[PDB]
Design a protein around this nucleic acid. Structure first.
Ligand SMILES: [K+]
Ligand SMILES: [K+]
Ligand SMILES: [Mg+2]
Ligand SMILES: [Mg+2]
Ligand SMILES: [Mg+2]
Lengths: 48, 98, 353, 193
RNA sequence: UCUUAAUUAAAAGUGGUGUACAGGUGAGUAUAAUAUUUUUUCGCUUAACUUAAAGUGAAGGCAAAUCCUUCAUAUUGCAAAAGGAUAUC
């Protein structure tokens, strides 16, 4: 309706939800690399 | 640091130089790695030339000097001026025209 | 370099309790060498410190330091700073902020981001604007940096109110104009005032503080109040100089301040979201607090500039003033009764006193 | 061949030239009868006039060559000097609606920066502006807000020779030791006896 | 007169590199040694020199720092860095 209403509706709920999810995406990246590294060693053991 | 420099020899009032490849931090006249040539600063004159033109005798092993400049040898200012005349390096100094 | 912090002028016992608590356990330890400062917080040396407590010669009289339980004995800096700040009621009291903020700066205490805006308000309303401007000038010592868009907006509010409180007299309006310019020059040149907290707020607004249209309107207000008085030969050579700046600043504000955009639409939409970044402007109480002089400046400048024969500016400034007035009137309806903003706007714009 | 360079507003005569380069060369200001003699005399002629020791004569011949090539010291590019004093002021341009470029220009002490034209608004090299209304650069003393003077000073362009402290590295501990002996011995004569 | 914030010049320093080069002497020292030459096969090299690539972010201590301490990041995972200076609009 007015500037005050539209400006009050907006809050950090979206910004907070974004930062937290982003940190989890890079966390899953570290897990993906670690999980991948374990695969590169698993196929080498049974190979030899 | 390898350097292409001059080793002052001769007698009093009779300078004579050896172009040498030596490590920077060594005595000027110590035995170098190689002797690339010689350099006489006093200009000479042709025997039967009455024109008055002078010249300077400089013996230099250009092939051996190019290899050391290629691997990273640092010639002194005097040896740089000589190597620039023969056409190996670019002059460091030039006469201002203005 | 500087003298040791001291609090020897306190009108109340409560104030002395808060200042001496921080002094003897948060400030004075900072004057010890880095080695001895580690023994005071180590149990293994508790016995030694009991017999021969560490001493430092300040004003001759040594200051003894004994073991301090880092968890149980250390005081709460935010709360003690509040107890002291709320008990200051005399010029002799507020003079301690210069030493208090210096001590916290030495202790590397990350004070609340809003603490500056609070000190400026409670101190300026008491009639001690100089103590603030002196700490700002001596930022190398007090760490009183202008890194918040609110502090600069709060500081420039009082610099004008003091001039407005005297009906914009020449002796005072000349003084205020010197203060406003000293701040816009410190924000631009002085590097002590720059920090990550400021770079973020300047990215949300897209204007640097020294060019933010909200802050430039302050300098335009005082200037517009100097030309209105005359627009004696010495005064004429000076009055003629104010008009050169008026048309200079006004012609610059219109270039930065977009068209048909008020104070809440001036900056990006993402600027009013974070509570640590320019969210105070959403509350009608705080909007009328800053949109009062800014609205009065655009109106006054629009009239003088119009008289000089500047059609464009006469219409450009009225464009902004019309935009700020439409928004300001909304805040006047949503604001609760008995609020500061409703009173200031009623006094400055309404002229009801 | 011995081309003579025309004097500059900052170096109008020989006494000024010898005063800037330093090395106590202003003593010989009387040997050079004219500005053209300085840039014409040779090594052998400077030696007969008495320009000595050889260190000062070779130092003079060096700066004599720099002046020809235009390699002036600091402030040599000035254009508005009066009695050896030059005033530096700041010129502000709006590079963008949210920026401002400030340049240290040299203008007459009376005219304002904005009044001067682009032709006379010289920009001195080696001087910059720190923040706002502050001129930073060697021998730039402030006169007021946004103004600074640059006066001719002894050794302003001098290549200062290095000096030893307490006789250098080899004779440092000894000069300080013997000096400490002279101090103690003096106190005994004052309060001891 | 006092008190802030700066400019400038000097004087001591802090840090970087160099004083591991040059120069002097022959007191001591009695030797076959992980010494040395030739051919074949090799390995190491975190300063300086030469060519190139990538990276040059964040705090704290000393009055301050390219000083000291420490962190993030750097194929996987362990492992780094420092800033200073001059122009243009
Ligand atoms: K040696
Ligand atoms: K011997
Ligand atoms: Mg929430
Ligand atoms: Mg011998
Ligand atoms: Mg960096």
């Amino acid at each position: 309706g007015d500037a005050f209403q539209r400006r009050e509706k907006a809050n950090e709920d979206f910004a907070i939800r974004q930062r937290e999810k982003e940190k989890l995406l890079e966390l899953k990246k570290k897990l993906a690399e670690q999980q991948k590294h374990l695969k590169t060693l698993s196929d080498h053991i049974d190979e030899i | 640091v390898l350097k292409l420099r001059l080793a002052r020899f001769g007698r009093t009032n009779a300078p004579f130089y050896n172009i040498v490849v030596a490590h920077a931090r060594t005595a000027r006249n110590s035995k170098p790695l190689e002797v690339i040539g010689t350099y006489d600063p006093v200009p000479k004159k042709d025997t039967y030339d009455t024109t008055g033109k002078l010249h300077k005798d400089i013996k230099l092993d250009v092939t051996r000097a190019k290899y050391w400049i290629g691997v990273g040898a640092q010639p002194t200012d005097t040896v740089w001026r000589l190597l620039s005349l023969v056409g190996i390096l670019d002059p460091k100094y030039k006469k201002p025209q203005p | 370099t500087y003298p040791v912090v001291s609090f020897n002028k306190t009108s109340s016992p409560e104030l002395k309790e808060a200042l001496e608590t921080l002094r003897e356990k948060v400030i004075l330890p900072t004057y010890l060498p880095p080695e001895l400062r580690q023994k005071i917080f180590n149990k293994k040396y508790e016995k030694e410190l009991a017999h021969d407590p560490v001493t430092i010669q300040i004003d001759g009289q040594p200051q003894r330091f004994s073991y301090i339980n880092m968890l149980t004995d250390m005081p709460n800096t935010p709360k003690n700073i509040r107890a002291a700040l709320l008990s200051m009621k005399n010029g002799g009291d507020f003079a301690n902020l210069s030493g208090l903020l210096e001590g916290m700066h030495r202790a590397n205490r990350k004070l609340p981001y809003w603490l500056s805006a609070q000190i400026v308000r409670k101190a300026c309303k008491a009639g001690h604007l100089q103590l603030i401007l002196n700490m700002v000038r001596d930022v190398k010592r007090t760490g009183f940096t202008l890194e918040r868009h609110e502090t600069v907006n709060e500081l420039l509010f009082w610099i004008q109110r003091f001039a407005w409180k005297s009906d914009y007299s020449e002796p005072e309006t000349r003084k205020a104009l010197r203060e406003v310019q000293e701040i816009l020059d410190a924000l631009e040149g002085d590097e002590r005032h720059m920090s990550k907290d400021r770079k973020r707020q300047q990215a949300l607004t897209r204007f640097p503080y020294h060019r933010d249209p909200q802050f430039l309107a302050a300098r335009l207000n005082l200037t517009a109040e100097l030309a209105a008085r005359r627009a004696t030969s010495e005064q004429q050579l000076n009055s003629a100089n104010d008009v050169k700046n008026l048309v200079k600043y006004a012609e610059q504000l219109v270039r930065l301040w977009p068209a048909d955009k008020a104070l809440l639409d001036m900056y990006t939409d993402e600027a009013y979201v974070a509570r640590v970044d320019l969210r105070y402007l959403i509350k009608p109480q705080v909007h009328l607090r800053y949109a009062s002089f800014t609205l009065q400046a655009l109106k006054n400048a629009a009239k003088i500039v119009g008289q000089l024969g500047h059609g464009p500016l006469a219409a450009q400034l009225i464009n902004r003033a019309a935009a700020v007035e439409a928004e300001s009137q909304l805040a006047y309806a949503k604001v609760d009764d008995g609020m500061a903003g409703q009173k200031i706007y009623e006094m400055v714009v309404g002229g009801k006193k | 061949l011995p081309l003579i360079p025309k004097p500059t507003p900052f170096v109008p005569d020989v006494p000024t030239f010898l005063t800037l380069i330093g090395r106590d060369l202003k003593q010989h200001a009387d040997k050079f009868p004219t500005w053209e003699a300085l840039f014409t005399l040779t090594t052998d002629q400077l030696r007969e006039l008495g320009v000595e020791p050889p260190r000062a004569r070779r130092y003079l011949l060096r700066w004599r060559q720099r002046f020809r090539e235009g390699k002036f010291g600091i402030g040599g590019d000035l254009k508005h000097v009066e009695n050896g004093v030059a005033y530096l002021k700041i010129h502000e341009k709006e590079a963008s609606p949210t920026r401002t470029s400030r340049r240290v220009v040299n203008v007459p002490a009376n005219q304002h920066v904005e009044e001067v034209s682009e032709g006379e608004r010289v920009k001195v090299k080696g001087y910059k502006v720190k923040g706002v209304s502050t001129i930073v650069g060697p021998y730039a003393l402030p006169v007021q807000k946004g103004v600074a003077k640059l006066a001719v000073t002894e050794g302003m362009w001098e290549d200062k020779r290095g000096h030893k402290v307490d006789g250098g590295e080899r004779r440092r501990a000894e000069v300080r030791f013997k000096r400490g002996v002279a101090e103690r011995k003096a106190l005994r004569e004052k309060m001891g006896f």
